[PDB]
Amino acid sequence: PNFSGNWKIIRSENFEELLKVLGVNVMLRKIAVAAASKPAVEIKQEGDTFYIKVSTTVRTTEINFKVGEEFEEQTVDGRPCKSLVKWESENKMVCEQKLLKGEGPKTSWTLELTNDGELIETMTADDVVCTKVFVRE
Ligand SMILES: CC1=C(/C=C/C(C)=C/C=C/C(C)=C/C(=O)O)C(C)(C)CCC1
């Protein structure tokens, strides 16, 4: 699969509820939700090696990983974690996260290239899922 692109959002669902599970208080959630409405996602892929940059007005992240090799990043609410991405299937990667310290909801994220040329991202916290869809600019 070729995840590479400058991806523009066309749909966002359930981010506020994700943040509620993660315990983000009401006024911070309001800020986060507004900014996360227009995120820019840049992906560069070379085989099973990836770079992903996510940009919003209130948070920008960059990660580098190889599928099947543990790495460190943060949860969406900003807690450090150890992560491991696996191919769930040919066009879909799944990242399991384990907190470095403390206890919290079980979190993960996924990226899938859909047959229409678009990209589905999910983020999960326990049972609750946020779904975003993108198309290249
Ligand atoms: C949660 C949260 C915040 C905002 C986070 C945002 C805006 C995340 C966007 C993530 C995306 C957009 C990820 C992706 O799609 O890969 C701020 C900074 C207010 C601090 C309080 C907790």
The CATH code of the domain that includes 42 is 2.40.128.20
Domain that holds residue 4: 1-137
CA nearest 125: which of 86, 96, 84?
96
Q: Rounded to whole angstroms, what are the CA distances from 50 to 4, 111, 135?
A: 9, 12, 18
Pocket of ligand 1 (CB under 6 A): 19, 24, 28, 31-32, 35-36, 39, 54, 56, 58-59, 76-78, 121, 132
Residues 6+ apart with CB under 8 A from 123: 18, 76, 107, 108, 109, 129, 130
* Tokens of residue 48, six digits: 């099973």
In total, how many domains does the chain have?
1
Experimental method: X-ray
Two structure tokens written together for 5 = 């692109």
Three-class DSSP labels, 22-33: CCCCHHHHHHHH
Atom of ligand 1 nearest to the CA of 59: 18
Q: From CA 133, how far away is CA 119, in angstroms rounded?
A: 6
Closest CA to 99 of 112, 120, 85, 82: 82
Give the β-pairing of 5-13 and 40-46: antiparallel
Q: What's the resolution in A?
A: 1.6
Instruction: Look at ligand 1, atom 14, and give the residue with the nearest C-alpha.
Output: 54
CA–CA dist 58, 30 (Å, integer)? 12
8 A C-beta contact, residue 22 and residue 125: yes
CA within 13 Å, CB half, 44: 5
